[PDB]
Amino acid sequence: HMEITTDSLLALLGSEKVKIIDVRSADAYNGWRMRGEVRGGHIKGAKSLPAKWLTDPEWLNIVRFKQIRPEDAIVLYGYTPEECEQTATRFKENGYNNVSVFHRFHPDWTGNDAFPMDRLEQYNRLVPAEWVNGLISGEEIPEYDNDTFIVCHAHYRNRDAYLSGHIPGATDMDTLALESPETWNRRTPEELKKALEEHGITASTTVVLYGKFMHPDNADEFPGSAAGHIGAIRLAFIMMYAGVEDVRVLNGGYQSWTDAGFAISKDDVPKTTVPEFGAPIPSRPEFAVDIDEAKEMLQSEDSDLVCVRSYPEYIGEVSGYNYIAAAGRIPGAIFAECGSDAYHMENYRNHDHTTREYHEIEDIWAKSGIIPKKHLAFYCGTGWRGSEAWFNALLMGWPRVSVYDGGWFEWSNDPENPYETGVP
Template sequence: MSHFIEISTNELQKRNAQGAKIIDVRAVDAYNGWKLQNEARGGHIKGAKSLPVKWIKYMDWIESVKHKNIQEEDDIILYGYNSEESEKVAEQFKKAGYSKITVYNAFLEEWVKDDSYPMEKLANYKHLVSAEWLQKLISGEDPMEYNNNKYVVVHAHYRNRDAYLSGHIPGAIDMDTNALESTETWNRRSPEELKEALEQHGITADTTVILYGKFMFPDNDDEFPGSAAGDIGAIRNAFIMMYAGVKDVRILNGGFQSWQDAGFEVSTEDVPKKPVSDFGVKIPSRPELAVDVPEAKEMLAVQDAELVCVRSYPEYIGEVSGYNYIEAKGRIPGAVFADCGSDAYHMENYRNVDHTTREFHETADIWHNNGITPEKHLAFYCGTGWRGSEAWFNAWLMGWPKVSVYDGGWFEWSNDPTNPYETGVPEEVSREA
């Protein structure tokens, strides 16, 4: 028997209008749009926050709650696929001192089935897949929303095949980020080099590519900790593949951690790559996804475009360069700040506690507060392109129409002494995260 009051659909609507906090306790993938129970409509109740039942096992669960601005005095309504999910999270709230807690158990039976009840979803959610979806694909089932093209699963890493060989998703090949980006400039490689690299990895423009990363920490701090960055490297490769012309690129939400959390089999086989003879389209097929220095300068001079700085605050104000191979410290004048997190190798302001992508409403709200809005042409950048690529992917997933990566970033900008730069705390900068 439930220890918490169960409310009706009408009561939920009434209290929602009065400012109640509606919380979706299902997996983040269901929240984003995947129909994990074959429901009539995918997505979540409009205005709901995402707080998956999975997170209650984490010691810093209450920090996730506070991070979402859910306060003890709030009127809280929890819903999921079933009452058991909601009750577990409700108990956790109760233990934390929250008292105004009710549950809504008619989500599947009433809300989803009635088109008059508003729902929302991530525009391009199909490109952010779950471990369960990928397991079905690998096991030979035909998972919902798959287009039946040839597929390749890619374990992305930076100079760390040991991370791959020590355990990876069965059937996945490995790809060093250096295959697609230059070690001299850290920009995407030339069209000819990209064509050769993609073909050697068995990827054509019509291949469905599912990428993921794995968190492995380097033994020495002087080593570029790209392998510690997990999915940042995978998303960096995804950006370059999409720029080249791969039509269907997907990211495993939460990376290898999600695969392990789901309890799926891990392989140590060194899977051979199966080269193809021709990529199939001229590279780049989508040149608009990348911005270089001349266009970046043009964007700084107009009102309907923004360079978006996805660096840490110490980098932004010029306290540190962020990298042991970049001497110059500072920022590009006129760029808008979109705080990545603690340092040059982490994206915690864009991630949940389980490494899945942060709730897209929260990211959009923070960006709007900083003047980062979908009607503008936005070019995201960081030091060398990785963090900028992840922020760009967030915007692309949300369906924002004019988003790019300024590929050169601070590294390229600061290498030219004629380019202006700033240091110190600007007069106005929002650091909400």
């Protein structure tokens, strides 16, 4: 495989016909210093194509989806040039003949402040499996300065999602602990205080949230019981709103844990009780938007509601849920198609459920006027998908992002509220 030098790569940075491809893990790409490098993240402009994906049959369709064409001049890099060999060969097998490997990313590029790098601004909220393993093992890990933690396996009324296999030592939290199946909003501060204490969570406890994807099926009575990792990010939103200072989400959920080869447990871990949450609830109320404020945001040039639903929901063909009656949409919201239905986030995730390359998210969002200068309230049917979209914006450091908790459920439960239907 041909090589490209450091000086050559610097000179070409910003050329629209050169495709730089980072084959490290998505978490390293995001900013995690997985090998102790002084500077984490990716070379400016690089795309993410983790070499782990070579074992997946989707690899070639992913490359094409990311608009990497055989006529492109491709530059690969990893922590070492040896880490790039298989990817380069796979490219050549598929008609990509202009492929170079950059050998000096680490430590030459990472170690030199003058060479531009990018990263997810708040990457340390989105943790890799290796970090969780180190935390549970009591090993030294970066981006951690606490002495109190809990790993929480989220699910919606489905303890078997946890009992069928979970991260060792983790306890389960039903999403019903923190949100009401009546309002489908976050519970009241007094309810939240008691629920968090009964799961052993204080405001100064580092909470690591994850869920298990079990293929939600719209035919089923409770498809959300299979969308465990959406549920985990939904609980992350509620905990951050409530006042847990250090909340992490395991990138890709349970899948990332087993893909790393770490041990699986089926023990029903007893919950510990803490006497006091230790902070006022909510400590970050600005993360949550309710319907009066959502109506105000529809009237402002400074702000927008962002509808994170599927297309059949958006045009009022279906409600999307077997527990929401009305089908339609909120007038004036910006459509941000989630994926296929109410329980999937394909447009925001990779095939392995890790978050989609954040540059692609910000690019698609920008085309619809979803941009960080606005106060944005993401929403969906009841707030699950909206919480995951919100979390992605939070990770990018966007300063004014919220979840309109009530969503379409609350909006349409009031017959006075106007709505739209059909293709716009």
